[PDB]
Symmetry: C4
Subunit: 460 residues, 4 copies
């Protein structure tokens, strides 16, 4: 048992020296790192092109259909008069009807296909307003049934104008929407030696009046559905994916075998000694847990990627998250190889022994941080753009801790002095106290904890 336990906790070099077993797992892990990184790089390069295609088409749509649109004005684009709104709506519909003769892209119309489109209709122009709305601010009276009624006009694309009779119910209007679909072919794919695929863009233009504040924001959004073109006329992507799957499966099997052997040795040692939990889990190789997790994530992400590349899925986010997290874990696992050398192991052990106190001090920091977040949100939110939501407040405070965007934060409040002197003085005290406390004391204590851990490692 003692000999076996000594072998189990032996370094790979010393294990090779003792039993002469070949280090298959180490080479397998190196090859796994290489192939996983290559797969991720190829996937990212492939996806960036589709992202660019969709974004460029959407920008072109914004320039084509939004009256008076200019780049960088998406957040403030809005109508303020009734004639402005009518002109915007009519311009959008007229551009839809004129698209074949004006657009630099090649687009095909789509008709029918269910709501909001009737059969043979390409564009749906709908206004949504309250079922009954009586508003008399003069008498301070109102009678509203909040049930929403939708009225849609259907426009058929031209073969190569009742929508002009639209009458908006301004006082009870909830919103206006324009819906239409356009088909295009992604020729750019030829640059990557891929077969072009067929895109259908569903375009939704929203004139939003849910605030009833006299300002109606205007926005354009697109959803892209990608298919394989039914008659395209212009293998080393699936093969690499199955290679990755096989590599990860072999790694998983070997790591599971190692973990099982560790568990069996733990049970044997406990039984022998009996003739604590923190000492029982000392037999657990955490690096192998990390490798098993990475293998599972990589296999799942590779299956999802194979499905996506065949156009049988559109869950890009989940697959990307899985593969990216797996790549991060496999690259973090390289620290294990450095731990076998004394000079690198000094630094890694310093971090390891520092980690618990760092976590506890993070717990101590969190409550003060949350109190400051709530106070800033409630007090400064009505006045400061960076304090409107709790997550935004947390982001602003975290940036201030790191010395970013400090002066603009102060200046936004400076722009409201004299108006509310009490609020300005409170903001001064709040910001100064928070930043001073966090930079003079908290970061210093983190430094002190790390320094103490390093000293403990260097002078045992």
């Amino acid at each position: 048992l003692r000999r076996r336990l000594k072998y189990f906790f032996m370094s790979p070099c010393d294990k090779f020296r003792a039993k002469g077993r070949k280090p298959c797992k180490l080479m397998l892990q190196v090859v796994k790192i290489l192939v996983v990184t290559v797969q991720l790089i190829l996937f990212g390069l492939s996806n960036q092109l589709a992202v660019t295609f969709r974004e460029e088409n959407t920008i072109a749509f914004r320039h084509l259909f939004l009256l008076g649109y200019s780049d960088g004005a998406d957040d403030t684009f809005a109508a303020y008069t009734r004639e402005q709104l009518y002109q915007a709506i009519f311009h959008a519909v007229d551009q839809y009807l004129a698209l074949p003769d004006v657009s630099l892209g090649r687009y095909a119309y789509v008709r029918g296909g269910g709501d909001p489109w009737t059969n043979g209709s390409g564009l749906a122009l709908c206004q949504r307003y309250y079922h009954r709305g009586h508003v008399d601010p003069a008498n301070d009276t109102f009678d509203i049934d909040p049930m929403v009624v939708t009225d849609c006009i259907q426009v058929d694309p031209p073969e190569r104008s009742s929508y002009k009779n639209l009458t908006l119910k301004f006082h009870k209007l909830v919103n206006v929407t324009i819906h239409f679909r356009l088909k295009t072919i992604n020729l750019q794919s030829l640059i990557n030696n891929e077969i072009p695929d067929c895109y259908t863009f569903s375009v939704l233009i929203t004139f939003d009046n849910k605030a009833h504040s006299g300002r109606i924001p205007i926005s354009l959004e697109t959803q892209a559905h990608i298919q394989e073109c039914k008659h395209p006329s212009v293998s080393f992507r699936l093969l690499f994916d199955v290679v990755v799957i096989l590599t990860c499966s072999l790694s998983f099997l070997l790591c599971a075998r190692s973990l099982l052997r560790g568990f069996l040795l733990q049970n044997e040692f406990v039984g022998f000694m009996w003739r604590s939990l923190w000492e029982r889990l000392e037999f657990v190789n955490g690096w192998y847990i990390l490798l098993v997790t990475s293998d599972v994530l990589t296999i799942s992400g590779t299956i999802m990627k194979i499905g996506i590349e065949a156009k049988n899925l559109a869950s890009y986010d989940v697959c990307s998250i899985l593969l990216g997290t797996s790549t991060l874990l496999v690259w973090v696992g390289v620290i294990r190889y450095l731990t076998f050398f004394h000079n690198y192991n000094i630094l890694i052990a310093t971090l390891r022994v520092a980690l618990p106190s760092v976590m506890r001090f993070c717990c101590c920091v969190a409550v003060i941080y949350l109190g400051y977040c709530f106070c800033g949100w409630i007090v400064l939110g009505p006045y400061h753009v960076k304090f409107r939501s709790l997550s935004m407040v947390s982001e602003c405070l975290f940036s201030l801790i790191n010395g970013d965007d400090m002066f603009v934060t102060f200046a936004a409040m400076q722009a409201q002095q004299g108006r509310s002197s009490l609020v300005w003085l409170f903001s001064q005290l709040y910001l100064y106290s928070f930043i001073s406390l966090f930079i003079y004391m908290v970061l210093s204590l983190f430094i002190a904890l790390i320094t103490g851990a390093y000293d403990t490692i260097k002078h045992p």
Copy 2:
């Protein structure tokens, strides 16, 4: 006495072990944290909607009434010619008269109600100029009586033009103002399942000529008065408020009882020993002082909030400050619970022992900081936008200490080299010396103080 003193300074767990008294106060404080945080979250969510409504209405007013206005131009919006000013004023008044037919919002006119409006008048167009003004820069002569005279034209809203004869006294003009009120109903409230309230916006448009510099800034400001609509036709908010008040009152009573018992024990101990002050106040539980302060603040803020939600008050700033500070204090009080565990108490005690020297070094830093503030204000203020006011100078220097906005600060001065070589060289020396001194030495000394405190704690 010795047994009672031992019990008094005993931890809650050990107090429970000794006497068995239930820890009512601890559970009460946990529940207090929960309910206070929930109250603050609900209040902030409610207030953000009103803030958004007011801001959107004001933006719509700026787009409706200010000739040639565009987003982001508030700071520089100004007139420079007489015809520009006339066109702006006439456009504002014409838009006021045309509002019902052009505006996307629904607004009602207000008439009379005292100054500056006569009875039956909706819009007041007033010009203020010196009583006697004779200015002859050709002869370098002037005769001015600085008494201000106001001339107001009253415009009645249309029923669904003497203001065009306005003649401005340009050489003696102090300013021009346009005042009018608009009534609207906040329908957006239905999204939160609230009854819509009735807003009256008082709109003031100012063309300011108090600098007499040939540039007249133009601004629009709104004040919102919120009432309950007199005939609206579309309980678990006041109940939670009284629950919060009761919880805080119980906490206050228990904490006051504990403090009174501590004072009595202190008096008994002093009397017995006599048969200092720093040792006499060791009987004071500062956490209970903080809890009592938080309870008082929360009760006051909750009363003010109840009044506000009934439309009986409009002091949002004071109530928000009270509630936010109380929430901050209750969340800071959570540190006490961590103090009962040794590993967290190490960090908290490190901070506690470091605090006095940190405060003394802050005092040492303050005088140097103030000297730099004054010098930079006097020298760089005529040339640098960030140095025009002392508070602005302090904010800029504090941001520089933290590594924010450094390059733009240098570049603003770079943009004036050659013009004033002496000033540019002085700015170079000033900025470089300040930043170098503060980053190489001051922050380092704060780090050293914290590290020494941590070492003292770890090696007693």
Copy 3:
């Protein structure tokens, strides 16, 4: 001797205990701090108003005289076609002639007064071009006499058009300038209860063609000459100045007496002991040297300020620098009072003992910094806007050391990848190595020096 030496190096409290002499100098220094700070605050408040007046007038002039000018476009404002230049020049002159009927300010014309104006002319429109210029890029030939010839047209202001025959020598044009003066009265002074003064603005509009690059930048500059108006009809500022002068003179006399006392005692001690220099200068009170310097600076600045407020001088920069530096020094001198208390003296002595090593390490840092500055200037200057001049390069590197403007610096180079791959790779290596070296090692060594100094102080 020994008793006198003991007394000389005694603290003010112990000196009072021993001899009982009143601490006149300490109270004098406190009063000096107060009065100097008040003087600086009043001076800055007074000067800011004049700065604002001049800046607003200049902005109004830019909006009045520059064709197509808009705020924020000063840096890029330029002409690119011949008709653009003609239109700009003619617009400027026409606006000059139309000023009385269009301007919101009140201005008077100035005539004569020497070059560039003849007698009775208000506006001078001058074009400067080479004496002989023959340029034939088709044949790659040129014959230029670089002597500059100036041709000026004089325009008389109207009484309440040969300049339209201007013919520019485009191929040999050096520049075009428009010069004119405007008189105005600063009424805004009444806000501060000051008597309005009379301003003369000299306005220079430059169309610059010294690059001969097809792009002619256009700029407007003003110089303000301030006088007292010769017939204005609408003491506690000079009295405070003489009070400040008297306070500083008394402080100077007392400090000089103390320094003479120290020198005499040093001479006596040296003579007695003889019956080194670093030990001989230990008798010097550096705080009194600083106080004497501040007194001299304050007296000089107060004299200059008295002259300025009488309109007898216009050297605002020198006076402001003197007074600001004096205020900085007097506020730094407050550290001496903290030096008398042990807990503050610990921190001050830590800084004092650290300072020499900090200076030596700054010397070590300077050479590496200069090498990086030169390399970045020569390599990145042709491509990076922030690297065009050596001072700009130094400012950029200093900001990078402190963690400011890093990403924009990287992105400016990113915007030129592919064009010059070698330069982009070099910039990557340069920036990464510089920042890593300075953050990982240099700042850490400064921290280590300060920490070692603090440890030496705490454990003697």
Copy 4:
């Protein structure tokens, strides 16, 4: 042998004391620093003027030839309709033909000279489109031969319109280009007392349609070819260059002699002792290796510079890199002089002993950093502009480590909450974990390493 070894490792002052040999090499190195710095400064000043000339001409070209162009719009400038593209192309050609009468600069036309221009043609207007292109998105069909066909129209400059019949093949268009050359003389050179040289700008305007996304970006680029003008009519630059070459050659010879001395002494010592490598290379003077490298770099760069100033080369980048790196190395070499003084040697030795552990920890950091880079690139790239490329991701993460651009990074993701909740939550976790880990632990460990090195140096 012992005396010789003692002399070899002796300081220059002690070598002078022992043998009396004059310190020629030290004075030579000082003079080398001076002359190299002067050469670099003169070269940079000379090159900046040419850079400015080229950039100003290119800006003028953008304003002249790009329809509706404005400053700061280079990245977003693009066409979106067919008539927009036609107008832009025709405007460019019309401005080319009208240049002599409208331009503020003086330009000469160039004809012939090879592709893409025929003989006697000044402007080439070429459209590139696929050989065969049939795109039917309605039927989801396409037949494309990806061979590119180019059709060019030649425009002869006017003597002091078939291009209007251009018909673009929009559905198969790859791009459109306009090529033309202009000759000009750089008169600005006279300011620096230089003979003006003759520039030929080759101007390429690209309307790019390689994405086929309905948005066609428009760009203008210039390449400058500089010659001596064949008949110009208006020595202490080459002399200084040969002086620099001679100084560097003498330094190289002396340093090589010293290194040969060291090698011979090393061999003699090894032979004697035999009667290791890390001890064998202790005989190598690394400062002399650095000096030899700097001498070689400076000589090569000076030869390249001599060629460039004669207009026999145009490889500015390589010469600038060589000279800048050499200047950086010579300025770094100044540290050697400080190493001879104990107080400076303390700091330098601290850095020296810290360097190995710093490098090892950099190796440890690199793998985690790369994992984060890959994960962020794959996950956030589709949504975040700063994450589109791996180098961009690395730059963003490095800036975040230093506290720069943090809030904008958070806000870009905030602008997409609700759309993809999973991606937003992942971005929150990713950013917070990365920044917290790197600021709390990594930088702290660097500080600890430097502090430990300093303590080891101070307490041997």
